[PDB]
Amino acid sequence: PGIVELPTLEELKVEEVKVSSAVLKAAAHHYGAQCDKTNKEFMLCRWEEKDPRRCLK
Amino acid sequence: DGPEKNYEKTLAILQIESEKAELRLKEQEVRRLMRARGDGPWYQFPTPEKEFIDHSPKATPDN
């Protein structure tokens, strides 16, 4: 069939959090309190568009 | 009674038998065609029901 179209390393290039899981769990509740709008937008687009390549932004 | 009664009774019997003959030939053709390509009421083989499919959002987003 057709060739699968997936983004490149430049499109996937973002500097990440180099943060341990214990640190994330310590900051977890306030992260879910303050950063909830962007997180909910990303989760909404993830369950709306099942393709992960449509939610890189 | 007379010969015309037997004559017309024979006509009615022949009409009924000829109609039964053509109906049996047509139902043979109908059954053969419908079994060959099931698109009418008969020979409708089953298929799993869509009503037992979960459509709620799930844990994995890629569904």
Swiss-Prot record, chain A:
A motif (Cx9C motif 1) lies at residues 35-45. Disulfide bonds join C45-C55. Complex I is composed of 45 different subunits. This is NADH dehydrogenase [ubiquinone] 1 alpha subcomplex subunit 8. Accessory subunit of the mitochondrial membrane respiratory chain NADH dehydrogenase (Complex I), that is believed not to be involved in catalysis. Complex I functions in the transfer of electrons from NADH to the respiratory chain. The immediate electron acceptor for the enzyme is believed to be ubiquinone. Contains four C-X9-C motifs that are predicted to form a helix-coil-helix structure, permitting the formation of intramolecular disulfide bonds. It comes from Mus musculus. Belongs to the complex I NDUFA8 subunit family. Residues 32-57 form the CHCH domain. It is found in: Mitochondrion inner membrane; Mitochondrion intermembrane space; Mitochondrion.
Curated annotation (Swiss-Prot), chain B:
One of its GO terms (cellular component) is mitochondrial inner membrane. Keywords: Electron transport, Membrane, Mitochondrion, Mitochondrion inner membrane, Respiratory chain, Transit peptide, Transmembrane, Transmembrane helix, Transport. It is found in: Mitochondrion inner membrane. The keyword Mitochondrion applies. The keyword Cytoplasm does not apply. It comes from the Eukaryota. GO terms for biological process: aerobic respiration; proton motive force-driven mitochondrial ATP synthesis. Complex I is composed of 45 different subunits. Accessory subunit of the mitochondrial membrane respiratory chain NADH dehydrogenase (Complex I), that is believed not to be involved in catalysis. Complex I functions in the transfer of electrons from NADH to the respiratory chain. The immediate electron acceptor for the enzyme is believed to be ubiquinone. Belongs to the complex I NDUFB5 subunit family. This is NADH dehydrogenase [ubiquinone] 1 beta subcomplex subunit 5, mitochondrial. It comes from Mus musculus (Mouse). The gene is Ndufb5. The chain holds residues 127 to 189 of 189 of the full protein.
